[PDB]
Amino acid sequence: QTNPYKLMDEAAQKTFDRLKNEQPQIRANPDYLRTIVDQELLPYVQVKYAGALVLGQYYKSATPAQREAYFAAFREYLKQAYGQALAMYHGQTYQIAPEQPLGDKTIVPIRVTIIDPNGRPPVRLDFQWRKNSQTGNWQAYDMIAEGVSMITTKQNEWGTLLRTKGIDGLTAQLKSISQQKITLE
């Protein structure tokens, strides 16, 4: 399947299936959550498009080798960070927005609501899907989470680091963060 609603449905279903049913494996090795991210989610993420946007002005002035190193570190960072997000699983489930015709739409926002029955209030995610012009595949290049863009958030969080130490500095920080072990609550 190739339609971005169907990709959302599949990725959600598979991820929650493994979270629901493989807690022994996750408790035994929390880093297994990085594998779930790597297999079920990351292939559908437009990592370089997002990463370039996070860099902003610093992307244009970076060399190809700097860019390569940055994108590698950024990908590893995403595995760690969203692995750590999956570590917050405690029986939540999800509802995805219903499929709508694609038409000639170029960027398709697809909402998923993370529901915690009898627990915490809903968490609204809005994935920004577009067609990768090179690969021909639909991918998400950003996620709005609780009303905050992940790209924008990271621009803000890493702004001073970029202003003072540039893409080299950010690459080193991403690599550092990606090496932190995932922890369960």
From Swiss-Prot:
Which InterPro entries does the record match to this protein? MlaC/ttg2D, Tgt2/MlaC_sf
List localization entries: Periplasm
List the effects observed when the gene is inactivated: Mutation leads to accumulation of phospholipid in the outer leaflet of the outer membrane and increased outer membrane permeability. It confers sensitivity to SDS-EDTA.
From the record, give the transmembrane residue ranges: none
Q: What is its main location?
A: periplasm
Which Pfam families does the entry link to? MlaC (PF05494)
**Keywords attached to this entry:** Periplasm, Signal
The UniProt entry's GO CC annotations, sorted and at most eight, read: outer membrane-bounded periplasmic space
GO BP: any one term:
phospholipid transport
Q: Which domain of life is it from?
A: Bacteria
What PANTHER family does the annotation carry? INTERMEMBRANE PHOSPHOLIPID TRANSPORT SYSTEM BINDING PROTEIN MLAC
Q: Which family does it belong to?
A: Belongs to the MlaC/ttg2D family.
Q: What does this protein do?
A: Involved in a phospholipid transport pathway that maintains lipid asymmetry in the outer membrane by retrograde trafficking of phospholipids from the outer membrane to the inner membrane. May transfer phospholipid across the periplasmic space and deliver it to the MlaFEDB complex at the inner membrane.
Could you describe the subunit structure of this protein? Interacts with the MlaA-OmpF outer membrane complex and with the inner membrane ABC transporter complex MlaFEDB, via direct interaction with MlaD.
Q: What is this protein called?
A: Intermembrane phospholipid transport system binding protein MlaC
Task: State the organism of origin.
Answer: Escherichia coli (strain K12)
The organism's taxonomy opens as: Bacteria, Pseudomonadati, Pseudomonadota, Gammaproteobacteria, Enterobacterales
